[PDB]
Each structure stands twice: as C-alpha cells, then as structure tokens.
Design a protein around this ligand. Structure first.
Ligand SMILES: Nc1ncnc2c1ncn2[C@@H]1O[C@H](COP(=O)(O)OP(=O)(O)O)[C@@H](O)[C@H]1O
Ligand SMILES: [Mg+2]
Lengths: 174, 401, 167, 152, 282, 343, 167
C-alpha cells in the first residue's frame, strides 16, 4: 500500500519554489502564515514519522509532500543530537542551535533531492525559502522535545532513539 | 503385511514426516543439519532437534524459499529421515514428496534422480504443497457439503503462495508467489531489536525473535494509530520477555514494543523488508481471482483458506477479509454507475476461514491421498524411470506443454 | 594401448584445424543463428567427421562445421566399478554445463562425454585454452576415477570394522 | 494450462518434401566404370620382396576417390592400411619425406580412416605416421580431410 | 549414524509422551498410529475399545510361524510378561500398557517396547546358541523368510554357529559395490582378531545349502557368519543378536550412503576442472 | 604495424572514407560507430542506429560520401550526411534470409549485396519514390554468398559462395549505364550471365578480389587453397595449397602480388608468375613478435587497401575478431624483411 | 609532471611495500643515480620534486579499488539475511581474507585514500562493519574487525565520533 501523504494542501495554499508554503502554529518569526487549527504540516509529519521511515517508495502527488519530506528528513537530525541530551532544557537549547544552522536548500549541493525540487529563481524567493525552512526547523525541534523525553526520568526515550538509524528512505540533510 | 507409503513435506523451517493413513505426522523436526567443523566422516551428522544443541557441530539450513540449494546435504538429510526416524526400507514403501509451485524442473529432476537411483524407491509423487492443504479443510467441512472450489494461501518460512482451485482443477496460470514469509518477519524483528534492545546475545537473537513472533505479535487494523497507542498508553501495549543466556545462565530481559505489529505488517506492506515487492496480499488475491474465469470468481472469494504457520497471527483474516470487501464492493459500485444505476448487483460474500490444522495441513492432505488406491496409479514408477529417465518428473501444473 | 603423448598430440592438432570458425546466419529459417553440426539442415556446411583412437575403447570424434565443433570422447572402463564412477562423474559435470560453456547436457551415443564449441566461444574465450581443457581432461580423468575406487575401498573397511568391532 | 483442440497438424513435418535441399556433384565418368584402385598383386608382390617404399607409392598412386562405390574404397583402404601397419618405425620418415604434397594429404585421409575401426595394434602405428605427415604437411593437411567432400 | 538403531523411535517417543503426561496428572489423549520398520514389519498403536487409558502396541510380522517355532512365544513372555495379551486382529503380537497402573522407572518398559522386533528374532538365536553350549549336533537348520525374496538359514555345530543370509540386490550398481563391501568383511579379522569369520558366494549358494532349494541368480548374494562361543555365550549373545538381525539393513544402508559419498566427491572434482576452464575466460 | 583495440569483441566489417580520415566499424552489434583520426588518437563522432540485427557488411563510397550497410535483419540502408547527422535511405532487397556482404560500385551508381537467400541483389536508385530497388542474379547459385568485388568496368561482378565456387556475373543495369566494352572474360555480358565458374569443389570461398587490370581474379577457400584465374591464359587456374590454417580475405596490392590473412592471425604474401603459370608463397610478412606471436590475437576477417589502390599499394588495413584494427606500411615490411620481395 | 606519483603506485603493486617505504625506495634509487651519473641530474631532480611536492585522470589507485571491492562485499554479506541467521554456505575463510586485506591497507597505504573511502557517503562502510559486528558471533572474525577499527581511529577523529555514537 502507499505511505502517508499530506492532506492539508488546498489550491488557496501558496507555493514557494515547488513546495507548499503552509501555515504553521509557532511563536517563531518567518514567512509562514499563522494557523488556527489543531493540526499542521508539522504535527502530521511527527504523527507519520515512525511509519514513513520504514517505507521504501514515495510518490510525490503534490507540493505539500515536498514540505513533509523535508521535515521528516530534519526530524532524523534532531534525534541524533537529542539522544545525547540528559535533560529537556538541554534539548531545547540544542534544537535552537540547529535551526539557526544554514542547511542546504533546493538548488545547491548537500540537498539530496535537487532533481525533484525546484530552486528559487529570483533572490527574493531564495530569501523566503531560507526563512520558511528555518521556521520549520525551530518548531519541529521544539515539539519533539515534548515527546522524546520521558517525564519520569526527564531523559530520552528508547522508543524514539531507535529511529536514529532509520533515515526517511536513505536520504539526509547532510 | 502391505505397507503404507512414506510422506515427507520438506519445508524451509520444519519438516513433516510419517506414514500414510494417519491424521498427524509421526515427526515434526526443523529442516536443519549439524555437521562437523573423507572416509566415513560424512556420516557424523545430526538433523532436527538433535542438531541445535550440538556445541561442536555447525548447523546448516539447506532449504531457502522452498527450494533446495545444497543437494549434498539434503541427500544426507533424507537418509536419516528414512533409516533413523521413519525406519523404512525404501525399496518397499512408496513415497510422496512436496514442492512449491515455483520449484525449478532441474530440482524436480535431481529429486527423482536421488530417490530412484540412490534409495531405489519403487514409486514417487511430487505434489504441490498448498493444494493438499485444501483437501484437509474439506474434512472439517460437512460431508457432502464439500466445496471443491476454493482459494488457498499457504505462507510458511520461505515463501507465500496464492493458489486457486475450481471444481477440483487447479488454475495454474493464475498462481501468484510472494517471497515474504516467516523468515522475513523474523529477520525484521531481529533487526528492530538490535537497534533498540542491545543485551540480547547474538547467538540468541533468532531464538528471541521467534519467541516474540509466536507469542506477542499480532496484526493491526491501521499502522500509525498503533504507534500512538504504544506511546500515549505504554503500560498496556508493551510486554516484557525474560530470556536465559546459554553461557552464563543469567537472565536477560527486554521490552517488546513496535515489533508486535510491524513484523506481520509486511504481508500488507512488504516493502518494509523486500524493496522488490510492494503489492499487499489483499491485492494479490484480487488479481489472482479476477484473472480467473468469470464463473468461478464468486465461489473463490467465498472460500479463502489460510494455511501455513505464518497465518497463525491474530486478526490476519479479519484484515484480509476487510481489505477485499472494500475492494470488491467498490468495483461493483463503479459498474452500477457506468451502466446507468438500473440494477443493484448482488454483493459478493467474502469469507476467510482459518482451519484447525495448520502445522500439518499439507502433510494431512498427503496422508489422505497416499491411503487411496488412486495414488498408486499417478505415481511415477521405477520402471518408468529406467525407460524415460529423470525427465519423467519435469512438469508441474503451473505451466503447459 | 599405444601411448599418451602422441594421442593428445594428434587430438590437439585436429582441434586447431576444426576451431577455424566464424559466425553464420541460417539459410533455412529467417534470422536464426544455430550451430549447424547439431541441426544438420545444411549438408554443405558440415565438414567430415574424423576419429582418433589409442585402441578400440578410447577414441575422440571431432564433428566440425563452419560455426560449431562437437568433440565426443570415450574413456577406458576396465571393470564395472569404473563404468559406474565415470557415468556419475559426467552427470555431475553436465549438470553444471552452464558453467562449462563448451559442454553438452547429454553425450553423443556411443561416447561418455561430448563438448560443443561455437563461434562465440572463440571470440570471447581463448581458443588455445579451450583445447588445453579438453586435453587436461583426457589425461586427468583416469586419475580421478582410481582415486574414487580407492576411496570406496577405504570406506568399505571402516564400515566393516565399525560392525565387527562391536562383537 | 492445457489445450482441448486437435493439435495433430503440428506433428507432420513438411520440410522433408522440399526442393531447395543441397545436392553435391559426382564424377559422371566414374559411375559406369570405377577406378580399379591399387591392385593387390602389384603391392603384394612388392611386399613379398620387402620393397615397402615402392609398394607404398603404388598404393597412393591409385586411389578411388572419384568412385561412388564403397567396396572398392574399402578394399583400397584395407590395402594401404595393410601396408602402413607393416612398416618399420624408423623407415616411415624416409617414406613420408619422399611424397609430394598431394600424396601427404591423401595419406592423412587414409590415416584418419584407420582410426575408425582399429585392430589390436593398428593405431600405435598410425599415430607415428600422423606425427611425420604433420611435420611435413602441417595443419593444412588435416583441413583437406575435413573439407574433403569426396571420401577416399 | 554408522550403526543402525535396534529400538524404534516412534514407540519410545509416543509412549514416553503418554507416560509423562499421565504421571504428571494430566488427562489421557487418544492415539491411533500405524507405521512400519525394516524387514516388512507393520506396527499399530491404538486405544482398544476406545479406552483412552489403555494403549496397545501390536505388530504384524510375516514369517512369524517360523518364529513361533524355535520358541519365540516363550522368549517374548520372559521379557514383557504381564504386558503381553491376546493378539489384535490381523496382528501377531500385542502388548498393553495401562496408563493408570504404571510403575515408576518407566524408561525400562519403554526401551523394551521399542525392541519388540528384536525380542521376536531373539528366539531362534538363543535356541541354537544353546545347542553349541550343550554340544548338541545333528539338529535341523532354521529357515526364516525375513523377506519374500530373501531367507536366513541358521545352523549349529560343535565349535561354531553358522548364520547365512540369502540377500538380493535389485540394481546392478548395488551388486558391484556390494562385492566391495563383502570383500572387506572377509578380511575383517585383520584388524579385529576376535571377530567372526565371514564368507561371500556371489551367485550360487554354498555346499551346505545346495540341497535346500536355494536360489541362484546374477543378483543374489549368499553371506555367511561364523560365530564362535565367545559370541554365543550368555554375556555376549544379547549384543551379538542386536547386530546380526540388522546386517542385511546395515549393508544396504551403506551401499545407498556410499553413493552419496561418491556424489559428494564428484561435485568437488567437477569444481576443480571448472577452475581450469576459467583460465580461458578473460 | 599499428594496433588500436577499439573493443574486446569482434569487428564484423569496416570501411574507410576517401581521405582515410574516418573509419566505420561494427563492434559486433546492430550499430555502426564512426571514428575519426584526431592526431594519434581515435574519437567517435557518430553512431548509426537503424538495424534490427547484426551488421555483416559496410562500404563507403569515396566521392558521394554515402555509406551503405547490410545486416542480418534482411535490410540495407544508404546513409547520407545531411548537415551534422547521417540520415538513412531505404532499400528494397527482397530477400527471405539474411545478408552477408555488400560492396559499392566503382562509379558509385549501384551496389551489390550477397545473401543467404542464394541470390545476389544489384541495387540502384529510384528518385520516383526515394527507394533503392534491386534486381536479382540467382541462376546457378545454390547457397550463401560470402564475398564480392567489382570489376573496374562497373559491370562485372565476382562472388565467393559456400557452394565451393567463385562464379563471375554480369551486373549490367540498362537504366543507369550503357552497354559495356568487351573484356577477355567474354563479350556476351547481359544481366545475369555466368562468365567463369571455378572447377574446385572443396572448401568455402571466403574472399574474392579483382585485379586492377581486371584480367586476374583470385579467391581464398577454407581448403587452405588460394587460387587465381587469368583470362589472358584462357581462364586457367593456379592453386597454392597452404600448410597452415585457412585464410578469410585477400586483396591485390599489385597486378602480380596479393596479401591474405585469416585464422593464422597474421598477413602473408602470394606471388604470381604468368610465365610459369603458378603461384608461390612470398613468406610471412609481419616479423615474428619478440600462444600467439603477432598483433592480431584472434582471426582476421577483412582486409582493405588504404593507400595506392590495387595498382600498387603502400598501406593496407586488417580488421579481426580480436576487436583490433592494424594498419600496415608495405615498404616498411620490404625494409624490415630484406628477404621479402614484392613483385 | 606526475612521475613521482605514478611510480609509487607501480612499486606498491609489484612489491607490496607501505606508502612510506615506497617513497624511500624511489628517493634512494634516484638520489644514487643522480650522484653516480651527474649527466642525469636534471632529470632526477624533477623526479624528486614530484615526490616531495595527484594521479592521471582515469587512473585510480590499487588500494582504492580494493576498498571498493571489500566494503562492497562485506556490506553484501551484511544484507544477506538468509546466510547470517540461517547459514548454509561457508563464509569464515572468505571474510577472514577480506578483513586481513583490509587491515594491511589501512595500516600501510596512504591515509588520505583510507580516509575518504571510509568517510564516503556519511560513513556508510564503517557503520556496516559496526552492524556486522553486532550480527556476527564468531570470535575469529570479531577479532579482525577490532584490529580494523583500531586502524580507522588512527586516521581521523570524525570516525571516532561515528563509532562512539554507534552501537
Ligand atoms: N502462533 C504462531 N504465530 C505465528 N507464527 C507461528 C506460530 N506458530 C508457529 N509459527 C511459525 O510458523 C513457521 C513455520 O511454518 P510451516 O509452514 O509450519 O513450516 P514451513 O514454513 O517450513 O513450511 C515458523 O517460522 C514459526 O515461527
Ligand atoms: Mg510448508
């Protein structure tokens, strides 16, 4: 059967490059509009993370799938740093520092999906992309730390750090 | 007096022996052979349960995907099956063997080349495994109400097959053959635990994965909803398995989590293990039946017989019977729309039954058969071998000419 | 019962004479490319058969053609226990004929083994090494049988001791 | 699967009754009267006195290649094959070196015919003959045995 | 496994399952099992009259009339005793083990249940082994048809017991290898000096049996066993009988298993040649 | 004495352009790869992909620059270089079996294809439909045709077959040329007339080449018997039976001497004396290299004349099953072998 | 222009020397022909400078080829689920041969080759051995892997972060 795709795409949803500039519920600042609903492109990708890393074939139906694939690849970067953390406060400090890092973007080397992603043509669209992703890289990390850490010991769970070796298909943002 | 026939279902995991006429086999042993690590030294070997425990011997598994790979060992595996366990003088007893559908002809030829020349048997019949499993179900069924028409799903350790049967005749050109089975489920649990639960010795990872599979595992209605149930309410769904080390004799314990439903899921998401296969078994069955003649599509949906040890999973038919009825009630809906909506066609009565005998279903259909007189007609014979040669056993129903 | 050096010297020369091959498309079927020595539809493309022999039993038969050669061989079998071990040995050599690319899955009638060498083997494989395999076969086969006859006799003693010792 | 229609038409072979089959040519002049071949009394009278080297050339002078008859060929083979078997092993190089090219090729034809049906010691001799004729005539002598459409 | 086992697995396996269940207090489970052994033997384990507490090990030897003679009816009684009861229908002997009236130390009655075929053959040997010890000569030989196309002649003398097998080799590849195996039994007294003497007449029988309607053929084989009193005495007649009633099957076991040794060795030499050809592959 | 291994597999056929600047090999496949001579290197420039089967014969017309191919798919294609790419042009051979050889004519107005259909197809152009229609010559022939060569009159044709013969035919096409001048081979040369049929009937004729004078033709056989017929001497044949493996292709370097090559994996030379009326072995040409002892490590299937024509050749090319192409320099062999003489 | 690097590859192939002693042997030979034969000093000094101070375009080192062949089989033998948990074929002698060869390369060859082929594709080849170690139970092979890990830690410190963060 197929993997889990994004249901949130709507024709009224803006496009950046060939991705889906979708609303995000965050206190962080960026080009992403603020959402009112109780579900977002982030809460989905965290719902569907543990299941989508076992599949080996993903068919890109729309552009919101290109936004989900990015997060699902970045969550595997959070867990590499979080498994080394001994307290949630130490994780939130590590999740900040990682989002500030300038990962590759569509068009340049490092990005594993340069072919099936559309780079920004103009410089203004480039500046919007680098600030949309950084808004995802920050709210993703902030929301994992609520889940990874067992409140009984305030230390990472083996049920999340078992997916450290499970890349999305085999790709990584590095 | 007149002697019954020997029956042997050499499978990937377990091997089923005995004589005809009986209801359950006289032996059920793993398909292993223990050898040392010229002269009479090729006879220092053990098979079955006498092979696992042997410390100074190397355990070998000569069968993969139902087919044999090293006939140097299987010729030694069969000369203890006969002379040690069964204690049969093969020049007197006929024989019934089993093959999967996709067994090559050259393996059927080397089989008969072994039994007829080396062991000098007077007869031999190489039957299809899952077909015998359907005859067994008919005895559980009422007498006279026997349904000759039925679909069969036989999944063991090596490979999984879907075989339709209509009015007694096998529709061989519509068979499917899914390479996913209990060995792929086991190596997938053996993988998830190496990532999470270190503390399992490498010598006891396999023993630990079968134990989890046979006991704790099950089948889920939806995958991602189970991950939440294991996360949100972990005390209820996470079990614990205490083992015993074999060196220090100290216990080791682990937490049994996502591998309870992820192993069996590869029946429905087989790209978890094998990237060369994506289609679920719920869809393979629909193509098997929709490729069959239009008149025997309904009776085949109504008798889907699960056989094999890797269909013992809890709630396996409940999901297969549900993934089909979704697929079948839609197709009838679409046709009702294209026609004009003037006729509401009759619904199809899907039924997936899971019969009481599974560990020896195929053997049982071979014992009922061998106890007949009709068996002694279709059996290839020593005389027919000397004349025609080992190509007498070259053909199977899966192909023509 | 002549000698072994000249026998292999004759066979080696006849083989170099008969491995003068080239591709050749068929003239009875549209675009087939078969070895004409096997199908034998075109008599003109079939060279003569020539035989070599140390004696009545041992001999070689080179059936050549424009695009194929067939080298049947008869091995000496003094006693019955050698007829058996040679018959099995070829069966286990024919079963792996997809790995011996120059081999027939059955032998010519009257002979114990038969090779078949097409014009695609000489283009790919080294023509002079294929000959050295046929020759190496013909002088080692006698050694590899007596080594089995001696291995059967050694086994029969242990099977006797392991029974009589218990008395 | 299996078929249930008459498939017997695929058994009969029509290629037997074909008009494009190859036809090799024969000598018309020899069908009426065959070449007499080496007469036995000629060679034999030269064998009684031990003149092997001349009984040798007498057998290779006449050869019924153009003859369609097989007995005179067989009689001819038994004559020359009787001669080669009686030679002295040291005298063979003396005899082979005398022959012209076209006699060495005809010799090697008769040699590869002696290997077909051997006596007790007919082949240990012919392998020595084969060594000498090859030293003179080379592989090209054998090729004119393979390509030869007319047997000896 | 070089030597064949004399005690059947299915009986020792089946009874010990019942005997370990009942003595654990669990309830009895039914059973109906038909199976076989060598020499045309046919067993039958059953719950008689449906009584799941009783199990009845029967057996159907042909040639048992030859064994009721020589006093095997008494030999078997001296072993099992109470367990021996009236024969089941179509069968020659029938034991009966009561699951509620079991003794402790069950491994002895189990191990004796597997040896039922042995205890039947063990009469004709103990009778003739005693004749040598008593010095009785002039008694008649014992013709036993342990198979339809085979026969076992026994005979006793002052200093030796002579045991003959009129075996048969179906294929001609077996009679060729068989001469090799028997040609080394004859020389078996070179290593094991105390061992019995063995002989082998290919087609024709010996002189002791030419009058006795023996069979001749290009595939038959006559095999003799000369047993001296260091075998037939009371301390060794058990282990001697445990080997002699398995000889015909020991010989054929190793003819069929020698082929696998040959096959096992040609798959290797074939791979040695295949290294020489791959020299031609660039 | 060069050796450039284009590949490891055979080279069924080859052809050179006028300048000898480009070469068109078939690397044992359905494609024709055109390589250009850039200095001391070889660079591939084009690849012709139209055949449904293996190629067996190629010829390059020097003036028109029109390549013609024949393959096992019962097809031929006439290629014209339009701009930067080669475009084919269809051919109608009308043969039920596969083709084996092709040769352009001297005047480039026709070509002849030899096939396993027991025929030879004389092809010419038809602008009415852009086709190349063909006429057949299949009167005496009884089996496959292996080689061909054109007389300098642009009419007469020689053909070596597996019928053990080297016939000579008149490929006169009235629509494209006037009647020819007479020749010592005969005056009566209508379409499809057997002028000369050889006498030998042992061995398959692999190669055939006409002499520059047009009065001498030689042919090689699998019987290890080179031959040569002279029309001035009433079509008498002179053989020279060799003592080695056969030859597979020949060509006249002069009016008297030839060069052959084949399964012996090197070239040789053959000298003709019409005074005596025989051939003589001119010795091996390539020196034994300082198992095989030459450049070609397998057989040779095609020999061609680059420089000097058949009148007096200075360089000839060999193309073999060892994926190789060796250029030879004739005078360098004269110098490197003081015993060697080219008559 | 590139002699000093094309000679070291020739010498390590036909001698088996380490990287260090490959440069010593050339510096000694050259430095001695320069001194004994002053007529050749200009050529020799260029050759020495090529050593003190890259390879041709398509030319690839021998040690780099082997590490493509070794890391590829050991990862193929890791992904062979049947043979690991359900053994049929013999593997101890082949694996012991590839791990010995690996240990002589990491220990002797140029570290920058053995660094990049281990740092390639985010340490894909290192992390496999780390899993094959977890999967293997035979101490004859667990011991050679340890000697190989101990040689990979000496090359770079990014590999140490990869192993310690692993299982
Ligand atoms: N309760 C169970 N649940 C799931 N699998 C089981 C159960 N019991 C046995 N099995 C599996 O059945 C498999 C063997 O199936 P079977 O068909 O009997 O043998 P084979 O596969 O060799 O033909 C084993 O791999 C075993 O793990
Ligand atoms: Mg099974």
């Amino acid at each position: 059967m197929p993997a889990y795709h994004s249901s949130l795409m709507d024709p009224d949803t803006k496009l950046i490059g060939n991705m889906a500039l979708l609303p995000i519920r965050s206190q962080f600042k960026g080009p992403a509009p603020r959402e009112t609903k109780d579900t977002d492109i982030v809460d989905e990708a965290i719902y569907y993370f543990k299941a989508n890393v076992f599949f080996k074939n993903y068919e890109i139906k729309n552009e919101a799938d290109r936004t989900l694939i990015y997060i699902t690849l970045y969550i595997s970067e959070c867990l590499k740093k979080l498994q080394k953390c001994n307290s949630k406060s130490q994780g939130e400090k590590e999740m900040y520092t990682l989002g500030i890092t300038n990962f590759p973007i569509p068009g340049e080397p490092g990005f594993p999906l340069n072919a099936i992603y559309a780079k920004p043509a103009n410089k203004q669209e480039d500046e919007v992309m680098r600030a949309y992703l950084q808004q995802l890289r920050q709210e993703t990390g902030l929301r994992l730390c609520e889940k990874v850490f067992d409140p009984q010991n305030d230390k990472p769970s083996k049920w999340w750090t078992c997916f450290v070796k499970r890349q999305f298909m085999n790709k990584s943002l590095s | 007096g007149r002697l019954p026939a020997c029956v042997v279902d050499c499978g990937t995991g377990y091997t089923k022996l005995g004589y005809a006429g009986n209801t359950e086999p006289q032996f059920i042993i793993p398909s292993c052979i223990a050898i040392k690590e010229k002269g009479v030294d090729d006879l220092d070997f053990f098979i079955g349960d006498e092979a696992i425990e042997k410390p100074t011997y190397a355990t070998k598994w000569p069968i993969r995907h139902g087919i044999v790979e090293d006939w140097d060992l299987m010729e030694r595996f069969m000369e203890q099956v006969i002379f040690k366990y069964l204690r049969a003088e093969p020049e007197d007893h006929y024989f019934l063997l089993t093959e999967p559908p996709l067994n090559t002809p050259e393996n059927r030829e080397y089989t008969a080349e072994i039994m007829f020349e080396s062991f000098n048997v007077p007869g031999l019949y190489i039957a299809v495994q899952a077909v015998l499993a359907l005859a067994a179900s008919w005895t559980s069924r009422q007498v006279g109400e026997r349904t000759l028409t039925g679909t069969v799903i036989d999944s063991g350790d090596g490979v999984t097959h879907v075989i339709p049967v209509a009015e007694g005749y096998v529709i061989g050109s519509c068979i499917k053959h899914i390479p996913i089975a209990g060995r792929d489920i086991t190596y997938f649990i053996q993988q998830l635990l190496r990532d999470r639960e270190v503390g399992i010795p490498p010598e006891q990872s396999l023993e630990t994965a079968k134990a989890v599979k046979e006991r704790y595992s099950y089948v889920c209605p939806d995958l991602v909803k189970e991950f939440n149930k294991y996360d949100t309410d972990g005390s209820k769904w996470i079990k614990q398995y205490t083992g015993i080390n074999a060196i220090s004799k100290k216990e080791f314990s682990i937490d049994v989590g996502y591998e309870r439903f992820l192993g069996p899921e590869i029946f429905f998401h087989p790209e978890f293990a094998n990237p060369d296969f994506t289609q679920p078994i719920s869809e393979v069955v629909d193509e098997v039946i929709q490729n069959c003649p239009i008149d025997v599509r309904r009776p085949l949906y109504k008798n889907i017989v699960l056989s094999g040890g890797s269909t013992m999973f809890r709630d396996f038919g409940r999901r297969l019977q549900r993934d089909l009825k979704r697929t079948v009630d839609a197709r009838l809906k679409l046709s009702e729309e294209l026609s004009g909506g003037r006729l509401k066609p009759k619904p199809i009565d899907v039924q997936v039954i899971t019969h009481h005998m599974q560990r020896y279903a195929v053997w049982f259909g071979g014992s009922m058969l061998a106890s007949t007189p009709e068996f002694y007609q279709v059996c290839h014979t020593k005389k027919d071998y000397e004349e025609i040669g080992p190509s007498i056993c070259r053909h199977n129903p899966v192909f023509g000419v | 019962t002549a000698t072994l050096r000249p026998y292999l010297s004759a066979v080696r020369a006849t083989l170099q004479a008969a491995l003068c091959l080239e591709n050749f498309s068929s003239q009875v079927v549209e675009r087939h490319n078969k070895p004409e020595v096997e199908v034998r539809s075109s008599k003109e493309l079939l060279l003569q058969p020539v035989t070599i022999s140390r004696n009545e039993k041992e001999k070689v038969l080179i059936e050549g053609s424009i695009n194929s050669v067939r080298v049947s061989i008869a091995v000496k079998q003094a006693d019955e226990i050698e007829k058996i071990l040679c018959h099995k040995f070829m069966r286990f050599m024919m079963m792996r004929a997809e790995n011996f690319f120059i081999l027939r899955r059955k032998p010519v009638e009257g002979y114990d083994i038969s090779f078949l060498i097409t014009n695609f083997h000489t283009e790919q494989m080294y023509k002079h090494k294929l000959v050295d395999f046929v020759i190496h076969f013909m002088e080692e086969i006698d050694k590899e049988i007596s080594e089995m006859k001696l291995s059967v006799n050694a086994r029969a003693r242990i099977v006797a001791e392991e029974f009589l010792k218990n008395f | 699967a299996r078929n249930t229609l008459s498939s017997r038409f695929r058994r009969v072979d029509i290629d037997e009754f074909d008009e494009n089959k190859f036809v090799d040519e024969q000598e018309e002049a020899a069908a009426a009267a065959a070449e007499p071949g080496p007469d036995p009394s000629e060679v034999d009278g030269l064998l009684r006195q031990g003149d092997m080297l001349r009984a040798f050339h007498a057998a290779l002078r006449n050869s019924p290649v153009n003859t369609k008859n097989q007995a005179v060929k067989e009689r001819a083979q038994g004559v020359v094959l009787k001669v080669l078997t009686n030679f002295k092993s040291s005298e063979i190089e003396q005899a082979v070196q005398s022959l012209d090219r076209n006699g060495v090729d005809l010799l090697m034809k008769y040699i590869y015919k002696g290997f077909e049906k051997p006596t007790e010691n007919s082949s240990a001799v012919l392998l020595q003959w084969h060594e000498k004729a090859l030293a003179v005539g080379g592989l090209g002598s054998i090729i004119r045995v393979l390509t030869a459409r007319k047997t000896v | 496994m070089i030597l064949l086992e004399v005690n059947n697995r299915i009986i020792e396996e089946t009874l010990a399952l019942k005997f370990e269940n009942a003595a654990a207090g669990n309830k009895p489970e039914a059973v109906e099992v038909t199976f076989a052994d060598f020499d045309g033997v046919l067993y039958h384990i059953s719950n008689p009259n449906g009584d799941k507490t009783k199990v009845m090990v029967s057996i159907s030897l042909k040639f048992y009339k030859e064994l009721q003679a020589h006093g095997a009816d008494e030999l078997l009684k001296r072993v099992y005793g109470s367990f021996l009861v009236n024969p089941e229908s179509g069968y020659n002997v029938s034991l009966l083990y009561d699951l509620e009236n079991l003794p402790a130390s069950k491994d002895s009655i189990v191990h004796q249940a597997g040896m039922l075929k042995r205890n039947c053959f063990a009469s004709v040997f103990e009778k003739y082994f005693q004749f040598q010890e008593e010095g009785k000569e002039g008694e008649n030989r014992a013709v036993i048809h342990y198979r339809d196309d085979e026969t076992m002649y026994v005979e006793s003398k002052k200093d030796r017991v002579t045991v003959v097998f009129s075996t048969v080799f179906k294929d001609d590849d077996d009679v060729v290898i068989g001469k090799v195996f028997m040609q080394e039994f004859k020389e078996g007294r070179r290593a094991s000096h105390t061992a019995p003497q063995v002989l082998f007449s290919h087609r024709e029988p010996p002189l002791e049996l030419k009058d006795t309607d023996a069979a001749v053929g290009d595939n038959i084989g006559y095999i003799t066993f000369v047993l001296f009193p260091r075998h037939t005495n009371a301390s060794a007649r058990d282990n001697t009988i445990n080997l002699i009633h398995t000889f015909r099957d020991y010989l054929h076991y190793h003819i069929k298993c020698s082929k696998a040794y040959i096959h096992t060795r040609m798959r290797a030499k074939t791979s040695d040649f295949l290294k020489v050809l791959n020299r031609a592959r660039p | 004495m060069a050796y450039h291994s284009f590949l490891v597999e055979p080279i069924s056929c080859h052809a050179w352009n006028k300048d000898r600047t480009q070469i068109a090999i078939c690397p044992n496949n359905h494609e024709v790869h055109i390589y250009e001579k850039s200095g001391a290197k070889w660079t591939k420039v084009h690849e012709l992909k139209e055949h449904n089967g293996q190629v067996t014969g190629i010829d390059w017309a020097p003036e028109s620059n029109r390549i013609v191919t024949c393959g096992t798919d019962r097809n031929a294609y006439v290629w014209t270089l339009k701009g930067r790419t080669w475009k084919p042009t269809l051919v109608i051979l009308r043969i039920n079996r596969a083709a084996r050889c092709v040769r352009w004519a001297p005047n480039e107005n026709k070509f002849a294809v030899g096939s396993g259909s027991r025929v030879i197809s004389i092809c010419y152009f038809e602008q009415e439909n852009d086709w190349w229609v063909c006429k057949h010559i299949k009167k005496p022939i009884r089996s496959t045709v292996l080689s061909l060569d054109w007389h300098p009159n642009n009419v007469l044709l020689a053909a070596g077959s597996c019928d053990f013969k080297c016939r000579i035919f008149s490929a006169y096409i009235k629509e494209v040329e006037e009647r020819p001048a007479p020749t010592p081979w005969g005056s009566k040369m209508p379409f499809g007339e057997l002028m000369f049929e050889s006498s030998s009937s042992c061995g398959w004729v692999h190669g055939v080449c006409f002499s520059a004078s047009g009065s001498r033709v030689a042919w090689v056989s699998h019987d290890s018997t080179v031959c040569l017929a002279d029309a001035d001497k009433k079509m008498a044949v002179a053989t020279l039976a060799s003592e080695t493996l056969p030859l597979l292709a020949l060509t006249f370097i002069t009016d008297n001497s030839l060069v052959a090559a084949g399964h012996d994996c090197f070239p040789v030379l053959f000298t003709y004396d019409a005074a005596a009326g025989m051939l003589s072995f001119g010795g091996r040409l390539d020196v034994p290299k300082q198992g095989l002892d030459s450049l070609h490590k397998n057989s040779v299937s095609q020999i061609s004349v680059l420089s000097g024509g058949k009148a007096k050749c200075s360089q000839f090319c060999t193309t073999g099953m060892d994926g190789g192409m060796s250029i030879w320099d004739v005078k360098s062999l004269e110098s490197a072998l003081k015993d060697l003489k080219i008559k | 222009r590139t002699i000093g690097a094309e000679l070291m590859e020739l010498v390590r192939r036909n001698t088996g020397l380490s990287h260090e002693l490959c440069r010593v042997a050339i510096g000694i030979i050259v430095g001695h022909i320069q001194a004994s034969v002053p007529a050749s000093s200009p050529v020799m000094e260029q050759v020495l400078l090529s050593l003190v101070e890259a390879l041709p375009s398509g030319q690839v080192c021998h040690d780099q080829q082997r590490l493509e062949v070794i890391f590829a089989d050991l990862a193929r033998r890791k992904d062979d689920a049947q043979q690991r948990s359900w053994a049929l074929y013999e593997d101890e002698g082949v694996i012991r041969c590839y791990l010995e060869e690996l240990l002589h390369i990491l220990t002797d060859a140029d570290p920058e080759v053995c660094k990049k082929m281990c740092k390639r594709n985010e340490f894909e080849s290192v992390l496999a051995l780390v899993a094959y170690y977890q999967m293997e139970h035979r101490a004859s092979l667990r011991l050679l892997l340890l000697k190989c890990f101990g040689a990979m830690c000496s090359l770079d410190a990014a590999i140490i972060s990869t192993l310690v963060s692993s299982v």
